[PDB]
Design a protein around this ligand. Structure first.
Ligand SMILES: Nc1ncnc2c1ncn2[C@@H]1O[C@H](COS(=O)(=O)NC(=O)c2cccnc2)[C@@H](O)[C@H]1O
Ligand SMILES: Nc1ncnc2c1ncn2[C@@H]1O[C@H](COS(=O)(=O)NC(=O)c2cccnc2)[C@@H](O)[C@H]1O
Ligand SMILES: NC(=O)CC[C@H](N)C(=O)O
Ligand SMILES: NC(=O)CC[C@H](N)C(=O)O
Ligand SMILES: NC(=O)CC[C@H](N)C(=O)O
Ligand SMILES: [Cl-]
Lengths: 669, 340, 340
C-alpha cells in the first residue's frame, strides 16, 4: 500500500463551500458552483456541500413561484450535472424543484454526470423572519422518484449515499431547520448507517445565531458519532431584510475540524480530512448506539441505499488535519489547564475515599525524587490535607541500595522536609547483599526493587498504614515494572491513570497554582529540571531516561497507546498519524512548558522502530503485569489499563499479527 | 394576584442535588436524600433530582445482585415515600428495582407520600469503564406497572408527570446514557409535551467528560426548547477504579441557569427558577417543533400522563434567576464584544 | 443402486471438530481448520462444525476490537473459502465479523468456494464468567445481507441450508448460549424444516458444565426430532481466567451417536452417519410436530432457504454408526436390566 495516501488510511476529504449568490440568476449560481467544485476536485475532495437553494438564492421569496425562474433552475441543474462528469467529489447543491403539485426545497446529490438523489427539506420554518411554507412544501414523508433530465431518481428524506469503495463514507443530507428540531432526520440516518451528515443552510445571520449553529452542529456530530458538514449562504442574498455571513464548518465527533472566515468578501471553502476509522471505532465500542438503532428498527430499515463508486486519488495528497503531538496533553493552554485541574482532582479524590474507608491509616510511600513518586507524594499530601489529617501520617522513605549519591535523593529529602511529612531513610543494601548471596548470585536490580517494596509493605504493617504506589499508565502499558514483589504492587496506585507525558504538566500545574509553600514550589521545579534534563554523565544508570532508553521515548509510546486503547487502530495508521504529527518540529503546536531545546522531531524510521517495540510489549509481554493491578482511579478519556475497567485482554497472547502488519505496510524509512 | 410570587408569573423552582453516597448502605443514602429534600422544601422547590442509583450507589457492581442489598433498597425507598408526605417538591430518586426477571436501573418519581411512577434506564452502557448489562436489564419498550409498597404504579420509558395546577410544568425522566444516544427518550418526550427534562447520572468523572455533559445537556435544553436538570454522583462512590465529581447543573433553552461546585466536600444543590412561560412562548412561535411532533405522532401519543397537584407557595420567595437589565446588551464583556 | 453406499440409504456423514486455537493469530486458526476440514473431506463428510469464534479465538476479550485482528480474520476467512472449493463438506466456521455499526459473533457457512451464509449469535451472555455484550452485538432480529469478499451473502438468524440433492439434509446453525434459553432459534428452525442442528460453542469448561451441554444438546435432538452437532473450544484458548476441554459430540433424537475425548492433547473430531430417514420417519408419524409448526406459522415461514448441491460420494465408505443386532434387546447390561 501507498503509506502516504490519506485515503488508503481511512480518510475522506470533504468540502463545505459558501459561494457567490446571484439572486434570480441560476446560471450565475451554477457558474460559481462549478468553479468551486473544480477547486474541490483539484484538492482531491470526495464531497462538497453548498448552501440552501443554491441555484436560485434562498431569499428571493415569491420569485420562487415564477415559472421562468424554476425553468432556469432546471437548466442550470442539468448543466451542473453534465459538467460533474469530470468532477471527483459528490456535489450537494440546493434548488427549488418541481414535484407533483408544488416546489420542494431540495438538495440535489450529484456525482460523475448522474443525479444520485434528491433530498427535500423536511421542516419548513414559518415564524419570525421565516416564511417558507408560503412558497414551498414540506418533504417529511415524501418518497418515490422525481423526474430530472429524463431520468427517474430517488426522492425523499430516507436516502443514504454510500461509497461502494469507501465503506466508511456514507452520506446523509438534511437542510437547515432540519437539524434544529427535537428529532432531526440526521439522527435517524446516523443510526441507519450514516457517517457523514451534510447540511445545506441559508441561515440569515443574527446576534448569536452562529452560536446556535455551532452548538447544534457539534452536538449532532457528537451524539450521532458522525462528521457534520455545514454550509451557509453568503454574499449576494437579498439584504432587503436580512444579512448573510456565509459561515461554513466541518465537525467530527464533537470536535471542530475546520471553519471559514465569517462575513467574507468572496467565496470560501472549509476542506478537511475526516477519519472514517475514528467514527467506525467509536461506533464499534459504544454498544448503546446500536442499541438505540435496534429500538427504532422500523425507522432505520426504511432507508434506501444509493450506491456510487467514488474512485478517489491514490497518491500522496497530504493530510488536512491537525494531529496533536501529545494526545494526552492538549497544546491549548486553557484546555491543558482544565485537563490538569481535572486529573489532579480525581487522583486526590479517589485517594481521599480509599482513606476514609480505612478510618484514615498512615500513607507509606517510597520517594526516589523522580517525577512519579514526587507527584504521588504531592497528591497524598493534598488528600491528607482536605480530609483534615496530620501530614506527619505521610511516611516518605528513601531506600537506597547501590547508588553512590546523587542530586535526586536530596530532592526527595528537601521536598519531604518542606512538606512537613515524616521522612526517614533506610539503606536496603545489606538485605540485598544477603538476599543475593542466599540465592547464589540484572538479578541484583531485580532484588533491590523487590526489597524496596517488601520493606515498604512490612513498614505499613508495623506502623498501620497502606503502601501507595507510584506506577503510571505508560509504565503499565509497556511493562516497565517488577511484577509481584516489585514496584508494580501496592495497596492503592494514585498514578495508574496518568501517562508519563502528563505527569510533568501536572507538576507544573501544582507549581503555578502555588497552593503549597513557595519552598515546595521551588523543590518541585528542581525535581522537574533535574529529571527532564538528561544527566551529562549517567548517574548510576537509574532515572527517567533509563526507561526511555529501553522502551523508546514516551512522547511516541503515549501516542501509540492512545491510538490503541481508544480506537484500536492498526499499527500502520498509528505510524501515519505520528509521522504527520512529529516528523517536522517547526509545524503544529507545542504545549506550554517545552523550552525549544526539548522539542524533537522523529523520523519514520524511529516511529516504526518504537511502534514495533510498543505493539510487542503491549499486546504480548506486559499484559500479565496489569492483570493483577492494585486499585486506583481512571484519569484520561483515552482509557485506563485496569483489567476491571478499560482493558480486558489475555495474558498468554502473541503480538505476531501487529508485527507482521508493521513489516508489510510501514516503509523502513 | 400576588405580584411578587415567582410561581404565579409562570416560574417553577427546580433543584439538582448531589448527595453523600454510602456504597452498600441504603438507609444511609436515604438519610442524606431526606435531608437534602427537606432543604429543597424550605427553598420552595417543586422538583429535586438526585444521582443515578441513589439508594444503592452506582459503583457497587455485582453487590447489586445480593438479596440483602435489594431488600434494604426497597425498605429505604418506602421510608423515603412515607417521609415525602410533608414535602413540597417532587423527588426523583435512583434505585435498583426488581421487576419480572431482572433488576432495572430506575428512577422512582415520588410525590406527597405516593409513587407517581418508576422510570427504567433505557440504554445500559457496556463498554470501557461500564459494565451495566451484567447486573441490570434495559427498559426500552417496557411498559405496564410495577408493584411497590402494595401498589401498582406506572413503569416505563413513556411517562410524563404533568402538574394539574401548573400547565407549564411537565416532567420527563431519563437516566445517564439516555441522553447520549442519537435519539434520546427526552426528545420524543419533549415533542409529546414535556417541558422539564430530568436526568439522573452516575457518571464517573474523566478528563473532558464535564464538557460532554454540558454540551449534550445544553444542546438538549436548546433543541427540545425545555429545561434540563442534571445531577451526577459525588463523594462516597467506590474509588476502586473511578473518581466522581458530583456535578449538578440546570439548563434552560441552551442557557445555563445554575450549577454547583465540582469535586465538593459535602452535599451540593443547584436551585433555579425555570420560566415555563418562556418555553411556552418559544414553542408557540416555532411551528416546526409541532411539525416534528406530528411527523412522529404514533411515537408521541403513546406517552402516559400522570397527573398530580403540586400546590406551590403563593407568596414572595424571590426569583432565583439573573434578569439582565439590558436584554439587547449582554453584561458579560466578551459576549458583548462578540455581539457588537 | 450401490447397496453399500451409506449415502444412497439416507445417511449423511457429519463431523464436529475441535481445533488448535492460537489466540490472536487468525491465519494459524485457519490453518488448523483447513487441515481438519481436509480430513473431513477424506472421510466423506458432508458437514464439519468448528467452535465459537474459531478464526480469532473466543477468549481474547477486547482484542476483538482491534482493527488488525478483524482484518486478519477477514483475510483468513477468504483464504478458507477459496480453499473450500476443493472440499466436499460444508464448513461452519466461527468468526467475529463487521456489520453496520458493530462486530457480531458469527458462524460463516462455507461451501464449495462460496459463502452460503453468515449467522450471528442471538443471545450474548453477560453474566458470571461472560462479558460478551461488551465487545459484540446481538443478532436476534437481524436479517438482510452482509458483504464478504466482494459478494452479498445472506445474513441473519433465519437461514436454512437445504441440500438440493439430499432432501433429508437441511442445516440450521445457532451458537453456544442460543440453545440454553427457553425458546432457542433451533426449535423454530426445526419446525421450519431443519434436520441437522449445528451449534458452535466456546464454552469455558466447569464442574458440571459438560453434563449441562449434554442435557440440552440431547434434549434438543429429542424434542426437535433432529440431529444435533456440538463443538467446543479446546487447546489454545487463553487460560487467564478459564479452562477449555474441547468437547465435541453428535446426538440424534436423544441418542448419542458419537463424542470425543475431553481435555485432549491435539485436535479431535466426532464423525458420524446421521440417518436422515429415521428423522423423516419420526416426523412423518408425530402429528403434533407439524401441529406445533402450524400454531407458529408466521414464525416458521419467515425462514430463508439457501439451496446448495452437495454431490456426495456414491461408493462404499462404510457406515460410521453402531447398528445393534437386537433393536429390542440392548447390549448394554444396565440398559437391558432396566428394559427387562
Ligand atoms: N532509592 C529509592 N528510594 C525510595 N524509593 C525508591 C528508590 N528507587 C525506587 N524507588 C521507588 O520505585 C518506584 C519506581 O521505581 S523506579 O526507580 O522508577 N524504577 C524501577 O523500580 C524498575 C524499573 C524497571 C524494572 N524494575 C524496576 C519509585 O516510584 C519509588 O517508589
Ligand atoms: N505472561 C506471564 N504470566 C505470568 N508470569 C510471567 C509471564 N511472563 C513472564 N513471567 C515471569 O514473571 C517475571 C516477570 O519479571 S518482572 O519482575 O515483571 N520483569 C521482567 O520480566 C523483564 C524481562 C525482560 C526485560 N525487562 C523486564 C518474568 O521473569 C517471568 O518469570
Ligand atoms: N455521563 C455518562 O454516562 C458517561 C458515559 C458517556 N458515554 C460519556 O462519555 O459522556
Ligand atoms: N460548541 C459550543 O458552543 C458548546 C458549548 C457548551 N456549553 C459546552 O461547554 O460544551
Ligand atoms: N459462550 C456462551 O455463549 C455460553 C455457553 C455456556 N456453555 C453456557 O451454558 O452459557
Ligand atoms: Cl511501590
Amino acid at each position: 500500500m501507498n503509506f502516504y495516501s490519506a485515503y488508503q488510511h481511512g480518510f475522506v476529504r470533504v468540502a463545505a463551500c459558501t459561494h457567490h449568490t446571484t439572486i434570480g440568476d441560476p446560471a450565475a449560481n451554477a457558474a460559481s458552483v462549478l468553479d468551486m467544485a473544480r477547486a474541490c476536485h483539484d484538492d482531491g475532495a470526495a464531497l462538497a456541500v453548498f448552501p440552501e437553494l443554491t441555484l436560485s438564492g434562498y431569499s428571493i421569496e415569491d420569485v420562487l413561484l415564477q415559472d421562468s425562474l424554476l425553468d432556469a433552475v432546471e437548466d442550470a441543474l442539468l448543466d451542473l450535472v453534465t459538467e460533474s462528469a469530470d468532477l471527483l467529489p459528490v456535489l450537494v447543491v440546493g434548488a427549488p424543484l418541481r414535484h407533483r403539485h408544488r416546489i420542494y426545497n431540495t438538495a440535489v446529490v450529484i456525482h460523475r454526470g448522474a443525479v444520485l438523489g434528491v433530498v427535500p427539506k423536511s421542516y419548513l420554518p414559518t415564524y419570525r423572519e421565516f416564511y417558507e411554507r408560503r412558497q414551498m412544501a414540506p418533504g417529511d414523508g415524501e418518497r418515490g422518484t422525481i423526474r430530472i433530465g429524463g431520468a427517474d431518481v430517488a426522492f425523499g428524506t430516507d436516502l443514504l449515499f454510500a461509497a461502494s469503495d469507501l465503506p466508511g463514507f456514507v452520506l446523509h443530507v438534511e437542510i437547515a431547520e432540519d437539524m434544529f428540531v427535537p428529532m432531526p432526520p440526521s439522527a435517524e440516518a446516523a443510526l441507519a448507517g450514516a457517517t457523514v451528515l451534510a447540511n445545506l443552510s441559508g441561515s440569515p445571520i443574527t446576534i448569536g445565531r452562529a452560536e446556535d449553529r455551532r452548538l447544534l452542529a457539534r452536538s449532532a456530530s457528537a451524539r450521532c458519532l458522525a462528521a457534520y458538514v455545514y454550509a451557509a449562504a453568503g454574499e449576494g442574498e437579498s439584504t432587503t431584510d436580512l444579512a448573510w455571513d456565509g459561515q461554513t464548518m466541518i465537525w467530527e465527533n464533537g470536535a471542530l475540524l475546520a471553519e471559514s472566515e465569517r462575513f467574507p468578501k468572496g467565496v470560501r471553502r472549509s476542506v478537511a480530512d475526516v477519519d472514517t476509522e475514528l467514527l467506525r471505532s467509536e461506533r464499534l465500542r459504544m454498544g448503546t448506539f446500536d442499541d438505540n438503532r435496534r429500538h427504532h428498527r422500523e425507522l432505520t430499515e426504511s432507508f434506501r441505499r444509493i450506491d456510487f463508486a467514488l474512485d478517489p486519488p491514490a497518491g500522496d495528497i497530504g493530510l488536512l488535519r491537525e494531529v496533536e503531538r501529545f494526545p494526552f496533553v492538549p497544546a491549548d493552554p486553557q484546555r491543558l489547564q482544565q485537563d490538569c485541574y481535572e486529573a489532579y482532582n480525581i487522583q486526590v479524590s479517589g485517594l481521599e475515599q480509599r482513606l476514609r474507608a480505612l478510618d484514615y491509616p498512615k500513607v507509606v510511600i517510597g520517594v526516589s525524587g523522580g517525577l512519579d513518586s514526587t507527584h504521588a507524594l504531592i497528591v497524598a499530601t493534598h488528600a491528607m490535607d482536605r480530609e483534615g489529617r496530620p501530614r506527619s501520617d505521610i511516611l516518605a522513605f528513601a531506600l537506597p541500595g547501590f547508588a553512590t549519591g546523587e542530586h535526586t535523593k536530596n530532592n526527595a529529602i528537601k521536598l519531604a522536609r518542606a512538606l512537613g511529612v515524616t521522612f526517614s531513610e533506610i539503606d536496603i543494601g545489606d538485605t540485598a547483599r544477603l538476599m543475593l548471596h542466599t540465592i547464589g548470585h540484572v538479578t541484583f536490580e531485580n532484588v533491590q526493587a523487590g526489597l524496596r517494596t517488601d520493606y515498604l509493605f512490612r513498614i505499613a504493617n508495623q506502623r498501620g498504614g497502606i503502601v501507595l504506589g507510584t506506577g503510571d499508565l505508560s509504565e503499565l502499558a509497556l511493562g516497565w515494572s517488577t511484577y509481584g514483589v516489585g514496584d508494580q504492587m501496592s495497596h492503592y496506585n494514585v498514578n495508574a491513570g496518568v501517562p508519563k507525558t502528563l505527569i510533568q504538566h501536572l507538576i507544573r500545574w501544582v507549581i503555578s497554582a502555588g497552593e503549597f509553600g513557595e519552598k515546595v514550589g521551588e523543590v518541585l521545579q528542581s525535581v522537574l529540571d533535574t529529571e527532564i534534563t538528561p544527566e551529562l554523565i549517567p548517574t548510576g544508570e537509574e532515572e527517567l531516561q533509563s526507561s526511555e532508553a529501553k522502551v523508546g521515548p514516551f512522547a511516541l509510546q503515549d501516542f501509540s497507546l492512545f491510538q490503541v486503547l481508544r480506537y484500536g487502530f492498526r499499527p500502520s495508521k498509528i505510524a501515519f498519524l505520528a509521522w504527520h504529527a512529529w516528523n517536522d518540529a517547526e509545524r503544529g503546536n507545542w504545549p506550554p512548558g517545552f523550552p525549544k531545546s526539548e522539542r524533537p522531531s522523529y523520523s519514520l524510521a524511529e516511529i516504526r522502530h518504537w511502534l514495533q517495540i510498543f505493539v510487542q510489549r503491549f499486546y504480548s509481554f506486559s499484559q500479565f503485569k496489569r492483570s493483577a493491578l492494585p486499585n486506583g482511579p481512571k484519569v484520561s478519556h483515552g482509557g485506563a489499563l485496569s483489567p476491571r475497567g478499560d482493558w480486558r485482554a489475555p495474558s498468554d497472547m502473541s503480538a505476531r499479527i501487529w508485527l507482521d502488519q508493521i513489516d508489510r505496510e510501514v516503509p523502513k524509512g
